[PDB]
Amino acid sequence: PILEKFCFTPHTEEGCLSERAALQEELQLCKGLVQALPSQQELPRLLSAACRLQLNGNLQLELAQVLAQERPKLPEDPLLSGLLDSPALKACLDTAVENMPSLKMKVVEVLAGHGHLYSRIPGLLSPHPLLQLSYTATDRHPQALEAAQAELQQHDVAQGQWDPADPAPSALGSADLLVCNCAVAALGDPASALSNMVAALREGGFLLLHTLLRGHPLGDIVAFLTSTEPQYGQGILSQDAWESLFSRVSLRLVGLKKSFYGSTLFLCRRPTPQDSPIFLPVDDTSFRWVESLKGILADEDSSRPVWLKAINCATSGVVGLVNCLRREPGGNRLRCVLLSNLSSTSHVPEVDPGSAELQKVLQGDLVMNVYRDGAWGAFRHFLLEEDKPEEPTAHAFVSTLTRGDLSSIRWVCSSLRHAQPTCPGAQLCTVYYASLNFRDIMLATG
Numbered sequence: 001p002i003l004e005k006f007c008f009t010p011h012t013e014e015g016c017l018s019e020r021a022a023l024q025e026e027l028q029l030c031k032g033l034v035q036a037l038p039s040q041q042e043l044p045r046l047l048s049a050a051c052r053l054q055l056n057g058n059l060q061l062e063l064a065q066v067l068a069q070e071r072p073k074l075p076e077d078p079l080l081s082g083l084l085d086s087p088a089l090k091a092c093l094d095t096a097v098e099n100m101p102s103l104k105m106k107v108v109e110v111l112a113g114h115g116h117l118y119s120r121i122p123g124l125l126s127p128h129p130l131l132q133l134s135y136t137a138t139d140r141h142p143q144a145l146e147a148a149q150a151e152l153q154q155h156d157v158a159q160g161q162w163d164p165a166d167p168a169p170s171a172l173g174s175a176d177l178l179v180c181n182c183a184v185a186a187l188g189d190p191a192s193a194l195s196n197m198v199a200a201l202r203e204g205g206f207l208l209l210h211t212l213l214r215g216h217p218l219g220d221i222v223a224f225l226t227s228t229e230p231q232y233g234q235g236i237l238s239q240d241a242w243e244s245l246f247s248r249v250s251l252r253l254v255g256l257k258k259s260f261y262g263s264t265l266f267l268c269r270r271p272t273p274q275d276s277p278i279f280l281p282v283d284d285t286s287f288r289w290v291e292s293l294k295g296i297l298a299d300e301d302s303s304r305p306v307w308l309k310a311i312n313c314a315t316s317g318v319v320g321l322v323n324c325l326r327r328e329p330g331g332n333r334l335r336c337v338l339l340s341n342l343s344s345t346s347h348v349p350e351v352d353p354g355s356a357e358l359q360k361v362l363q364g365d366l367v368m369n370v371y372r373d374g375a376w377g378a379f380r381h382f383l384l385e386e387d388k389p390e391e392p393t394a395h396a397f398v399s400t401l402t403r404g405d406l407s408s409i410r411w412v413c414s415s416l417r418h419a420q421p422t423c424p425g426a427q428l429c430t431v432y433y434a435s436l437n438f439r440d441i442m443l444a445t446g
Contacts, residue, residue, distance in 0.1 A: 002127055005384045008370070009091045010377040015260040017082045026079050027217065027261050034221055042069065043077040050225065064228040072114050075184040079218060083210065083265050084117075088257035090124050091380050092267045095255060096177050096206040097131060098378075099269070099367055101332040104132045107177035110164050110197070112137035113145035115181030115210075122155050127381065136172070138162040162200075164193035174202035182211040183263065186231040190245055198249045204272040204365070207251060208265070214238045216262025239264065254364050272365060277305045279353065282321075283312035297330045305365075309337040311351055316340075319379060322367060337361065337369045346373050393417065404446025 017023055029039055033047040037056060050063040075081050083089065097105060112118050118137050125133055137152065138160030139145045145152075145159075152159075162169050164180075165188035178197050180187075187193040201207060212219045215238045226232045237245065239258075246253055246268055255267030278296060282289050296306055310316035322336045337351055337358075349371060351358045361369045361376065368378035395416040402408040419428055 003384050004127065004381045006379055006381060008372055008377055009380040010375040011254065012256045012258075012375075013088070014258045016088055016257055017086055017259045017261065020082070023078055023082050023261060026077075030079070030221055031217060034224070041077055041079075042073040043079060045069070046225070047221075060227045063225060072116075072184070075114065075116050075181075079261055079263075080183060080212075082261065083257060083259050083263050084120055086259075087382050088265055089120070090382060092208055092255055092257065092265060093121065093124055093177075094380050095267065095366070095378065096208065097125070097128065099204075099206070099365075100176060101204075103130055103327075104134075105177065106134045106175045107179060108136045108138060108160070108162075108172045108175045108200070109179045109181075110138055110162065110193075111140070111181065111185035111187070112160075113139045114185035115179070116184075117179045117181050117210075118155070118157055119151060121179060122157070127383070134158070136160050138172070164188060164196055167196055168200035172200055174205075175200060176202065176205050178205070178207045180207070180209040180211075182209060182235040186229060187235050188231055190234055190237060191248065194245060194249045194251070198251055198270060201270050203270060205270050206254075207268040207270070209268070210263075210265050211242070212236055213258075213262045213264050214241070218262045242266065252363060254366060269365065271363075275304055277307055277362065279307050279309065281310075282308040282318055283310045283316060297325075297333075300330055303333070305333050305335055307335050307337060309351055311337075311339045311348075314340040314342070319368060319370070326367070335365075335367050335369075339371045341371070341373055343373060400444050404444075406444055409444065 026039070026041055026044065029041075029044050030047060032038075033044065033051055037051065037058075038044055038048055046063075046066070046069050049066045049069070050058055053059070053062050107121070109115060109117055109121075118135060122133065122135050125131060133156070135156065136158040137145060140161075140163045142161070160169075160172070162172060178201055180193075180197070197207060212222060214220065214223065214236045219236055223233060223236055242264070243253065246266075250271065251268040252271055253266060254269045255265075257265040259265075280289060280292060280296065282293075293306070293308070308318050308322065310318050316338060318336050318338050322334045325331045325334050339348060339351070341348065349355075349357050366378070369376060370378055391413065393413045395414040396411045397414040398409060399412045400406070400408050401410060401412075416428065420426060421428060
């Protein structure tokens with residue numbers, strides 16, 4: 001069975017990867033070397049080599065190239081791929097999948113030779129039972145990404161040629177999702193590349209982009225390096241710079257995951273032609289609103305969206321309802337707004353048509369909009385840790401979890417936690433030593 005946990009996921013999250021230490025240890029190392037101009041990780045090794053040749057006046061050419069660094073191992077650095085391995089990527093991908101008129105998705109990557117998102121994105125989407133995907137990897141040069149063709153082939157991927165700077169080829173056409181990963185790969189120009197991408201993106205699609213932020217420690221550190229390659233330096237921009245660039249191309253930011261070490265993960269959605277949105281209270285306890293929705297949804301000729309809003313209870317189950325109706329005919333229009341707050345103290349916003357927050361969410365145009373304790377997000381599915389849980393217990397017994405596998409023997413919590421000591425026939429006894437007999441071995445071996 002596929003085991004997952006249904007948890008709230010705020011749209012914007014900052015300081016995502018604070019819990020990890022290896023990332024923090026790497027950051028402490030990196031800042032140490034940079035100070036005044038030591039580990040198995042690639043980026044610290046590169047910094048050490050760069051500072052080794054010269055303490056001052058380091059050559060740009062020498063630090064650009066060195067043995068053990070010419071491999072595209074920069075993404076392999078735990079700092080570089082911290083957010084991709086974190087559940088932020090899954091959250092963004094699930095948000096992209098949910099907001100889709102059909103049940104088929106078309107995603108085209110750019111600069112996959114260095115982005116290496118093809119090796120991670122398709123796997124995260126296996127849990128979806130019915131979703132059918134089309135993944136294609138595009139790069140400027142045919143030899144680029146010529147390696148690992150077995151990795152590409154084992155997944156239903158398609159080769160490409162598109163250069164972000166120049167216009168997109170028609171083969172890609174109107175796609176649902178565009179993954180860039182500018183953090184490691186080098187774009188020709190922010191403005192031009194984004195303009196071409198949004199030109200390729202269908203009406204109402206998404207643009208998932210991963211990049212390192214200027215004005216932050218790691219961003220500045222990478223800025224100091226890579227001085228030989230100007231394109232890479234172009235990709236690194238301040239957060240406000242990225243936000244300003246986004247508006248210029250008529251693209252609206254719906255999601256933004258920000259790691260503590262400066263990394264960011266944007267999710268931008270192409271606006272769809274605006275239309276007058278219907279509104280329907282769905283909080284009546286007699287279900288009389290069902291008739292209204294039945295009539296409203298009946299007129300399939302109309303294309304106006306329907307916004308079921310429940311603001312009178314935190315236990316309204318509109319999420320499952322919109323999930324179910326979206327599969328039914330006419331369900332491409334359904335959208336939700338739910339105010340579920342778990343704390344009495346926390347305030348309740350106003351979702352009046354004139355209100356500003358309703359305007360913001362409408363600009364977003366996202367199916368699920370849940371407001372839980374001062375933040376907007378939606379419920380998302382995350383695979384839970386495989387390791388079995390444990391706890392301290394004075395009572396526990398040895399048991400072979402997998403019959404006939406001596407390597408499966410482990411201590412398990414015993415029922416002797418609950419017992420009565422008064423009964424003379426009970427006589428609970430502590431165990432200091434226990435013996436093994438032929439019978440025990442026969443049971444263990446199976």
